[PDB]
Amino acid sequence: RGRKERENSSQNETLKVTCLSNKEKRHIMHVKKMNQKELAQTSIDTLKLLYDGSPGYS
Amino acid sequence: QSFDIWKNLDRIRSTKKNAGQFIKGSLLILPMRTEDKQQFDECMDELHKYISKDILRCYPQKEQKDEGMLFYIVLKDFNILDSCFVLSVLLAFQKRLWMAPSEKSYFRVPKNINLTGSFYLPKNIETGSSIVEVGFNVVPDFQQFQVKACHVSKFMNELSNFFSQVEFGKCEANVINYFKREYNRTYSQISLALYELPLIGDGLFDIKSYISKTRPIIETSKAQMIKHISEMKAYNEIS
């Protein structure tokens, strides 16, 4: 990398890294996987139950 | 400025910055109605002596009502000046029959009259005030445009400012007959709806089954209303 980029980037600030333990990241990724699969399987079904008494429902 | 059409035509020819070029693929349809035909014919003959046959065309009705005629005025491939001239003449003439029956001049507009009208344009427009658009138009294909309560010079300036911003293009060939059939279909539907107005009671609603279908229901609703009045009287009572 360039010199002036190094004098600009190493003087602005130093950010904080967050990190979690093994069981915490395992439980969070398992909840995210079940949320992704329940969003991939779901669909909006409001028009079927909202026009239920319509004369052309059958 | 003045109350003359030709002076405002000279003014709108002067300071509209080379407005002699017409619009490629341009179309306008003005459906109007007259009580009588003989007074309309002299003004239309003067208009055809002033405006050419290729630019403006006229379409009569089929004489179904026999009292109120319906005439289409189709301006095709028109310039911005001839449009203002034709709309000024027609908007003066279709209101002079009610306001000034004794003035007797088909090209001199008085001061007591305000120009207020409605004209159709095709859907393919691009605008990128007195003339406004409409919401909930009745025609499937065309857009209705409204002008209201203007003098002659304001009408000229507003029509020129409207046609200087809008961009037409690529109109369908026999769209005039399509608009004729759709207009006749829509107003025949509302004429049939007015024909359905005496046929409400006992005519075509199957009243013999509709009484028996709602005979216990209105009675139970009336009992609920009586219970509501009694419960309201018990609620407002101090005792």
């Binding site: - | 409400i200 609703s221 609920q224 209303m225 609620y235 101090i238």
Partner: protein, 267 residues
């Protein structure tokens, strides 16, 4: 709380009375019990719901009935209700004042000059909807306008706000009735509870009535939906809406103009 328990795999000779006897009156109090039968055959499918008021008694009943002899088989009385992102929204209540009641249709009017009458104040609020009483307190420069509809109260507040009656600007808000105001004054003099009561409903659905509709006046009614069927009378009873209503209203307003041009009424 209304805790629900789902009994399953029941026998065929077990009606709702036997399930209610086995659920209620055994160290608990079951509020409701219903066995889900067939839609057209009438026979029970072997499942039933039991909803109790307390959750602890329902939990004790589910713990005691887990494996009990129910008509020759097991009871299976485990609970039905009680990590997804989608949950139904839950809310608290505004403790039922006279502002947050959707059935509250009476408008408190104030800022009067102690000069308007009751018939004139009826004439201010007459075309907004049907009305029941226009009585006002004396010496308090205020009043009460109770309608039947809530949309009529919305139209009355949206129109009549900022309208000066007798060179005096009006103040429109909500309020209770006279008996509820007397109860609030009796409970506020000792300051024990000061609790209010909700205004009763209309026992909906109501097909015949059309809201924001007034009628002052044999009847052969076709009961068609485009017209009006029933209406509340103007004091009060329930009237069938006839066809000669706009004619009677026109005769009434012409009589009102004739009697108001002379001074027989001020309203």
């Amino acid at each position: 709380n209304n805790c629900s328990i789902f009994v399953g795999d029941l026998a065929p000779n077990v009606t709702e009375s036997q399930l209610f006897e086995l659920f209620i009156n055994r160290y608990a109090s079951t509020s409701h019990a219903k066995i889900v039968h067939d839609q057209v055959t009438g026979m029970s499918k072997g499942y039933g719901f039991v909803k109790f008021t307390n959750s602890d008694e329902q939990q004790l009943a589910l713990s005691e009935m887990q494996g009990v002899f129910l008509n020759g088989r097991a009871i299976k009385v485990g609970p039905t209700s009680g990590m997804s992102q989608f949950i139904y929204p839950v809310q608290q209540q505004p403790s039922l004042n006279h502002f947050t009641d959707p059935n509250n249709t009476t408008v408190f009017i104030g800022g009067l000059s102690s000069l308007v009458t009751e018939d004139e104040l009826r004439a201010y609020f007459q075309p907004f909807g049907t009305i029941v009483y226009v009585k006002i307190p004396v010496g308090k420069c205020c009043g009460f306008v109770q309608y039947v509809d809530r949309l009529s109260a919305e139209a009355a507040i949206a129109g009549m706000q900022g309208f000066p009656i007798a060179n005096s600007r009006v103040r429109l808000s909500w309020g209770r009735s006279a008996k509820q105001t007397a109860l609030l004054q009796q409970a506020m003099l000792s300051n024990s509870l000061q609790v209010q009561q909700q205004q009763p409903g209309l026992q909906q659905p109501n097909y015949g009535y059309i809201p924001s509709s007034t009628c002052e006046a044999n009847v052969s009614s076709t009961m068609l939906p485009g017209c009006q069927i029933l209406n509340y009378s103007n004091p009060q009873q329930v009237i069938m809406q006839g066809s000669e209503a706009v004619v009677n209203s026109t005769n009434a307003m012409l009589n009102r103009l004739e009697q108001g041009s002379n001074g027989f009424m001020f309203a």
